Design a protein around this ligand. Structure first.
Ligand SMILES: C[C@H](N)P(=O)(O)C[C@@H](Cc1ccccc1)C(=O)N[C@@H](Cc1ccccc1)C(=O)O
Ligand SMILES: [Zn+2]
Length: 866
């Protein structure tokens, strides 16, 4: 298919205002009858062009007249010579059982369910499958009662009946006009957890969580999180739910985390099912954030939707911002910010440095499913957060209110959102808008000067964004650049100039500019880009002592973690260079000293300590380098772990023991202590072998929760401890029947430092708990290997690339969306040495020649080979 361009947007020639659907459901052959009320808006001679994929057309009527003026073409049904207003009736067949791509109506175990975003509804019937067409849906579902006792679609049950031959039916009406990507249908046999939330104005909402039979023991936390999400959106954003019923269905087979279908969200079971023996603290907090995310889409996505798919970030950047604010308000703001900055620097910057680079509002798309990206989501949220930084909470909320006032019940654009924020706040965002249009990561360079004669501190700040493959032209951005200045006692120095206070958020809008601060009585230590105030790379020539000073004194916990990152970066870079010359780790004494001080500091929040004591991942480390040496990075990461383990052995054990908790609670203070304890465990695993082996095996066996059990198992694998094989087998024996739990074990197998990792991974394709039919299994074994074990994936013999090619050859046909997620590591080839590039190019060329190459892979392969 050809690329589509944002600049080609044109209003639809026809709208559909109302659609009545009937599904005669069966896994082999489903018959869809769709009755649409259409209204022409364009030229009177314009044909109606309906999108359709893999449909068997049965009939076409206009006002009940069999229509002869139509033609089917690739991906379309084109209907000519129509009245201005008419009733379209389409009957067509589809085959859910044959739908391995999991796009449209498909089978998940014994259940039938849908996924329609972005363009899945056209796999169900011929329709105006574009998000600026908003219709009122009524959905009648007819099915075998024994096999499908629950028949669900969006909105409220308005009719129901029984039929001969053991069939029954239910009809649903959703009063809110919607784009078809928000359509959902679910049929199957479920256990149901039912509860209620009463809104602040008194609306009683029925909450219903549908899970596979036997999974009720894993449902209450998700339900609790839904209620928490509802309450928070009221308190923080002043938003209430707008329907009578809120349904969530947890399904096993799903190509995303979850989906905000109006009143009938469909979730990957990973983001619903939890009990303390199956789920970790991280699972609990992820369920919380994804339940929140889907709930928050009700306003930011559904009540206001997207005019076209290039505006995806309008809902995704804003909804991610909302889920981050939810998690941050309920939990540790510092830990959430830290985690989101690790994702930005370690994963999103890599995308912005890749052949797939795009602005948060893309200009060119071949396959829209390829644009559900770290950029659109996470950088999108950073852009929303910059607006929040520039406006402050009160004006930001005024902007939110104006946005909803203007655009409720419509399909809007990124520009509409920015305009609402500007108009509500009187803050000029004209230059700021360039963040929507420009790809790549800006680099902000800071030079400073303290003048004792004048008691002035001057920051000379410059910016540039390197060219990206998609954009030869780059321009300066409006960068909110937050600072704080500290005296030698760690006290904040008031920012001022010429007898007036200066805002700590500097407006870095030029290629080069200077900022002068007076009444700086003594030489300051600066904290720069506070709370990661803009998604940029910072270049400032820190001394080690400035950084350790900030670790001790910075007022925001984020700054203390960030200073530790800058300190480590220097020595990670040093030691990778040493590795390449066959030299062992070298680290100045004062560095281990800084981490010792973190361990022994009584005043530090355990939440913060735990994150400082969590070394950057191999993907985070890769972004420190122009050319990635993934073997050096992996070995340096282990060497650094071992060195700190040795130098801090006593302190690590003291803190490990001090943070023991006999009670298991999913509560933030407890989670912090446990995260610290297990951060210590990572290092303790690299102590004297017998001592480490005993400690690790003890934790695995004595654990009263999965967080602690998994931490121990992970350490046994990381440090290749004697107990590893026993613990791994014990886990398999206990948990093989549980796919979500086995995913953690597949991840450990895939990311193992063992020399035989690829052999093991290949063997696990035959494991009883693995299947190529399940996206979660694929991601946990194959994705984890390719993406989270770059040292093995990039083995010099090219074996990792060949393995991935085999897997992608299958998945290109089976499930292109999952295939396209999995190909990402191969498209980073230009970051690697020449020998690696050659092998990766050969792999990509093999894939390029596949019979029936998917558009999903074609788009990425083309860019990677350019
Ligand atoms: C496509 C839906 N409209 P969604 O709700 O945005 C899906 C989203 C749910 C989620 C939110 C927050 C954390 C984790 C999951 C989702 O799956 N996003 C993924 C990325 C993604 C994967 C596959 C398809 C689409 C997006 C992510 O942010 O990690
Ligand atoms: Zn979303």
């Amino acid at each position: 298919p050809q690329a589509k361009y944002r600049h080609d947007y044109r209003a639809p020639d026809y709208q559909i205002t109302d659609i009545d659907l009937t599904f005669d459901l069966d896994a082999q052959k489903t018959v869809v009858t769709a009755v649409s009320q259409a209204v022409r808006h364009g030229a009177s001679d314009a044909p109606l062009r309906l999108n359709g994929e893999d449909l068997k057309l049965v009939s076409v009527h206009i006002n009940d007249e069999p229509w002869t003026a139509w033609k089917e073409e690739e991906g379309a049904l084109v209907i000519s010579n129509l009245p201005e207003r008419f009733t379209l009736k389409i009957i067509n067949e589809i085959s859910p059982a044959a739908n391995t791509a999991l796009e449209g109506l498909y089978q998940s175990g014994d259940a039938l369910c849908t996924q329609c975003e972005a363009e899945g509804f056209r796999h169900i019937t011929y329709y105006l499958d574009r998000p600026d067409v908003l219709a009122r849906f009524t959905t009648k579902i007819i099915a075998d009662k024994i096999k499908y006792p629950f028949l669900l679609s969006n909105g409220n049950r308005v009719a129901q009946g029984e039929l001969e031959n053991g069939r029954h039916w239910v009809q649903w009406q959703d009063p809110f006009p919607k784009p078809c990507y928000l359509f959902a249908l679910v049929a199957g046999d479920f256990d149901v957890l039912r509860d209620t939330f009463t809104t602040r104005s008194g609306r009683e909402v029925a909450l219903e969580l549908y899970v596979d039979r036997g999974n009720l023991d894993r449902a209450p936390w998700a339900m609790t999180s839904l209620k928490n999400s509802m309450k928070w959106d009221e308190e923080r954003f002043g938003l209430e739910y707008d329907l009578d019923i809120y349904m969530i269905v947890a399904v096993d087979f799903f190509n995303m985390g979850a989906m905000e279908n109006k009143g009938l969200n469909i979730f990957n079971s990973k983001y619903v099912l939890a009990r303390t023996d199956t789920a970790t603290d991280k699972d609990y907090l992820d369920i919380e954030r994804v339940i929140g995310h889907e709930y928050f889409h009700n306003w930011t996505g559904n009540r206001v939707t997207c005019r076209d798919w290039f505006q995806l970030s309008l809902k995704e950047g804003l909804t991610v911002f909302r889920d981050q604010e939810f998690s941050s308000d309920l939990g540790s703001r510092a830990v959430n910010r830290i985690n989101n900055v690790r994702t930005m620097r370690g994963l999103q910057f890599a995308e912005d440095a890749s052949p797939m680079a795009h602005p948060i509002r893309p200009d060119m798309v071949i396959e829209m499913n390829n644009f559900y990206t770290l950029t659109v989501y996470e950088k999108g949220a950073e852009v929303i957060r910059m607006i929040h930084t520039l406006l402050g909470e009160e004006n930001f909320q005024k902007g939110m209110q104006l946005y909803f006032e203007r655009h409720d019940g419509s399909a809007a654009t990124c520009d509409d959102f920015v305009q609402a924020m500007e108009d509500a706040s009187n803050v000029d965002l004209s230059h700021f808008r360039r963040w929507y249009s420009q790809s790549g990561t800006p680099i902000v360079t800071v030079k400073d000067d303290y003048n004792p004669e004048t008691e002035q501190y001057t920051l000379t700040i410059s910016q540039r964004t390197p060219a990206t493959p998609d954009q030869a032209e780059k321009q300066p951005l409006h960068i909110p650049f937050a600072i704080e200045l500290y005296d030698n006692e760690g006290k904040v120095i008031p920012l001022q100039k010429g007898g007036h206070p200066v805002n700590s958020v500097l407006n870095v809008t030029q290629a080069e500019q200077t900022f002068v601060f007076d009444n700086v009585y003594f030489q300051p230590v600066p904290a720069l880009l506070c709370e990661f105030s803009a998604p940029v790379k910072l270049e400032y020539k820190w001394s080690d002592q400035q950084l350790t000073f900030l670790m001790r004194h910075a007022r925001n916990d984020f700054s203390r973690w960030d200073a530790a990152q800058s300190l480590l970066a220097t020595y990670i870079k040093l030691n990778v260079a040493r590795h390449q010359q066959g030299q062992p780790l070298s680290l100045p004494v004062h560095v281990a000293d800084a981490f010792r001080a973190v361990l022994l500091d009584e005043k530090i929040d355990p939440a913060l300590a735990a994150e400082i004591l969590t070394l950057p991942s191999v993907n985070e480390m890769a972004e420190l380098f122009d050319i990635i040496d993934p073997i050096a990075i992996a070995e340096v990461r282990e060497a650094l772990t071992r060195t700190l383990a040795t130098e801090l052995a006593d302190e690590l054990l003291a803190i490990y023991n001090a943070n023991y908790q006999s009670e298991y609670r999913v509560e933030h203070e407890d989670i912090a202590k446990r995260t610290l304890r297990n951060a210590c465990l990572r290092f303790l695993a690299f102590g004297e072998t017998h001592l480490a082996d005993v400690l690790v095996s003890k934790q695995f066996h004595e654990a009263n929760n999965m967080t602690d059990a998994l931490a121990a198992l992970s350490a046994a694998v990381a440090a290749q401890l004697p107990c590893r094989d026993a613990l791994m087998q014990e886990y398999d024996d206990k948990w093989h029947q549980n796919g979500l739990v086995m995913d953690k074990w597949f991840i450990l197998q895939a990311t193992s430092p063992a020399a035989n990792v690829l052999e093991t991974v290949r063997g696990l394709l035959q494991h009883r708990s693995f299947t190529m039919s399940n996206p979660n299994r694929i991601r946990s074994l194959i994705g984890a290997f390719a993406g989270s074990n770059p040292a093995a994936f990039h083995a010099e013999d090219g074996s990792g690339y060949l393995f991935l090619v085999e897997m992608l050859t299958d998945l290109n046909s089976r499930n292109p969306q999952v295939a396209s997620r999995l190909i990402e590591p191969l498209i980073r080839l230009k970051r690697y040495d020449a020998k690696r590039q050659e092998k990766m190019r050969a792999a990509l060329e093999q894939l390029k020649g596949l019979e029936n190459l998917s558009g999903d892979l074609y788009e990425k392969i083309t860019k990677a080979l350019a």
